[PDB]
Amino acid sequence: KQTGYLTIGGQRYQAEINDLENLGEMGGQVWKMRFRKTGHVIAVKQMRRSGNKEENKRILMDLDVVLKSHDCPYIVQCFGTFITNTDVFIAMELMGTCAEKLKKRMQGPIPERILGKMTVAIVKALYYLKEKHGVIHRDVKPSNILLDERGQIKLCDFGISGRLGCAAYMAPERIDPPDPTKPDYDIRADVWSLGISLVELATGQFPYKNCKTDFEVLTKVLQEEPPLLPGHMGFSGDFQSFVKDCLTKDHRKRPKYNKLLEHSFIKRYETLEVDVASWFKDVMAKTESP
Ligand SMILES: C=CC(=O)N1CCC[C@@H](n2nc(-c3ccc(Oc4ccccc4)cc3)c3c(N)ncnc32)C1
């Protein structure tokens, strides 16, 4: 009724409503709140018992994954849940923004060094989901890639439980498949989506911006060469090779995450020191919101 529990930084706290400052909306119903006992600002989501049955099923399936992903550094964490007679309140790690909004703020390219660190994190998150929990994400795109002012990069909880349109990020083998009732693709389609995401964020241009309809984009995916990084922006050979491998059109030759994690681009950005935190803070201070 009056007391819940938040676990943050390996410590459990009692939390009554007086311990939390409502700081308003995030960019479903979710509030930014500051926990006065620690200074953390967290996200609190409300799932109403009377809510839409599909939206609630999605929230519960995503939460179930988040709860059992406490050992993955690259997935947003849950700090607690509070159940009342009429509602469920879910306390989540609050990130600063997604990569889609970051591109919009940047009005252009995001630097390769940031994208390298992003790639490492997001591949490891997707690989973790598949290996540990059997989850094929199926919706890899910039809006699901989160960053914060601590320099962390993490996969969003939304849809983290997988399937249970984005023609833009659809792999060729997903376009006119034999049985879309039994859509039996694997993680390689998400590898393609990651590649498209990286080109979009690196160039500040979605590779199919000039298309006027969803069907048009699918024609381009099939008919055109893969939309590789351009050569006029100073991208490393490693980055260019990584994106080329992700955007292998024939899925039978497209690498899986385990192979991608061996790639020179990933090994490089594992060791390179990149101050993502300071960079992110600079962006957020020089730019406006939506
Ligand atoms: C100041 C905000 C406030 O009142 N609000 C705004 C938001 C919707 C409403 N709300 N929120 C809570 C609530 C419940 C829990 C929690 O933190 C947890 C603590 C431990 C684990 C998980 C979460 C934060 C707020 C809440 C509630 N208890 N009862 C009714 N409406 C509520 C009205």
Question: Domains plus CATH for the chain?
Answer: 3-93 (3.30.200.20), 97-285 (1.10.510.10)
Binding site for ATP: residue ranges?
26-30, 45
47 CB within 6 A, ligand 1: no
- Positive or negative torsion for Cα 127, 130, 133, 135: positive
Resolution of the coordinates, Å: 1.7
80 CB within 6 A, ligand 1: yes
Through-space distance between the first and last CA atoms of the chain, rounded to whole angstroms = 37
Q: Which helix (H) or strand (E) holds 282?
A: helix 276-286
Return the amino acid letter for 259.
Answer: K
Q: Which of 103, 79, 102 is nearest to 90 (CA)?
A: 79
User: How many Cβ atoms sit within 10 Å of the Cβ of residue 168?
Assistant: 19
The structure tokens listed for 14 are: 């009692």
Residue 52, burial from CB neighbour count under 10 angstroms (0-12, 13-18, 19+): exposed
The structure tokens listed for 41 are: 């600002």
What span, in angstroms and rounded, lies between the C-alpha atoms of 174 and 269? 30
Residue 136, burial from CB neighbour count under 10 angstroms (0-12, 13-18, 19+): middle
* φ and ψ at residue 48, rounded to 5 degrees: -80, 140
User: How many Cβ atoms sit within 10 Å of the Cβ of residue 105?
Assistant: 17
Residue 190, burial from CB neighbour count under 10 angstroms (0-12, 13-18, 19+): buried
Question: Residues with Cβ < 8 Å from 268, sequence gap 6 or more?
Answer: 116, 236, 238
Ligand 1 pocket test target in 1, 89, 94 with most atoms within 8 Å of CB: 89
The structure tokens listed for 78 are: 């849950």
4 CB within 6 A, ligand 1: yes
What span, in angstroms and rounded, lies between the C-alpha atoms of 185 and 183? 6
H helical segments located in 187-254 = 188-203, 214-223, 237-246
- Positive or negative torsion for Cα 29, 32, 37, 40: positive
H helical segments located in 37-183 = 53-67, 99-106, 112-133, 172-175
Question: Residues with Cβ < 8 Å from 43, sequence gap 6 or more?
Answer: 26, 30, 31, 32, 33, 91, 92, 93, 94
Question: Residues with Cβ < 8 Å from 272, sequence gap 6 or more?
Answer: 113, 116
Q: Which helix (H) or strand (E) holds 24?
A: strand 20-25
* Long-range contacts of residues 191-194, Cβ cutoff 8 Å, at least 24 apart: 191/246, 191/254, 191/255, 191/256, 191/257, 191/260, 192/246, 192/247, 192/248, 192/251, 192/254, 193/139, 193/140, 193/141, 193/166, 193/169, 194/119, 194/122, 194/123, 194/126, 194/140, 194/246
Alpha carbon of residue 142 to chain centroid? 6
User: How many Cβ atoms sit within 10 Å of the Cβ of residue 164?
Assistant: 10
Q: Which residue matches tokens 């351009």? A: 230
What span, in angstroms and rounded, lies between the C-alpha atoms of 290 and 86? 33
Q: Which of 257, 270, 255 is nearest to 130 (CA)?
A: 257
81 CB within 6 A, ligand 1: yes
Q: Which of 217, 173, 169 is nearest to 193 (CA)?
A: 169
For ligand 1, atom 1, which residue shows the shortest CA distance?
Answer: 22
**Alpha carbon separation from 229 to 108, 121, 238, 244, 265 (Å, rounded):** 14, 20, 11, 8, 14
For ligand 1, atom 12, which residue shows the shortest CA distance?
Answer: 89
Identify the experimental approach: X-ray
- CB–CB of 125/72 below 8 Å? yes
* Long-range contacts of residues 104-108, Cβ cutoff 8 Å, at least 24 apart: 104/290, 105/283, 105/284, 105/287, 105/288, 105/289, 106/204, 106/283, 106/287, 107/204, 108/204
- CB–CB of 77/93 below 8 Å? yes
- CB–CB of 239/114 below 8 Å? no
- CB–CB of 32/148 below 8 Å? no
The structure tokens listed for 240 are: 């260019």
